[PDB]
Nucleic acid binder design. Sequence first.
DNA 1: GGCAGAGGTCAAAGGTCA
DNA 2: CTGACCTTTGACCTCTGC
Lengths: 77, 76
Amino acid sequence: VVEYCVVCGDKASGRHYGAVSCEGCKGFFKRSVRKNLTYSCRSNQDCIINKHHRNRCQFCRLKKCLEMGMKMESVQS
Amino acid sequence: VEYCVVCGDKASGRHYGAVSCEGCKGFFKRSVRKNLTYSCRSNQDCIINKHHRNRCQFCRLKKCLEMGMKMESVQS
DNA sequence: GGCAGAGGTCAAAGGTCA
DNA sequence: CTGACCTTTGACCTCTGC
Ligand SMILES: [Zn+2]
Ligand SMILES: [Zn+2]
Ligand SMILES: [Zn+2]
Ligand SMILES: [Zn+2]
């Protein structure tokens, strides 16, 4: 009955943009895609996305978001 | 129009669990972020008001905590 | 109907920099 | 260090199309 975000391991509201996601992960994906935002990383793209420290590397979040099958094409827009 | 429990200034909004001015919000963030502890030169009951808020950082932080600002809420 | 999976709001967190 | 002011986040909403 409990489902966890494939990005950050937070309680997941459900499948969003093709991925079991927390509400935070959804909204990041949207804004990133809607604003055509690519970010950069300052730690050799090694950044580990955890519920606690997910807002550390926007770049590394979007990497994991796409890695885990969130789909730009699914965000309206 | 609501007033900051720490300094008594006009509050921006509720900040870390208490109706706070931006200043005390800022103070609180940086204090917890840099795990700053503070020393008092006036026996630790320094009056904290808008006009004279920055005399004692120590006494301010005490007030911040006492009036219910929650460190845990401030993030890393 | 019923509900997943899109959308949006705005307080409360964040970061900026004179 | 400070705080006026600006940006992001994510809990909680609604809509609507299978
Ligand atoms: Zn997540
Ligand atoms: Zn990174
Ligand atoms: Zn104040
Ligand atoms: Zn003092």
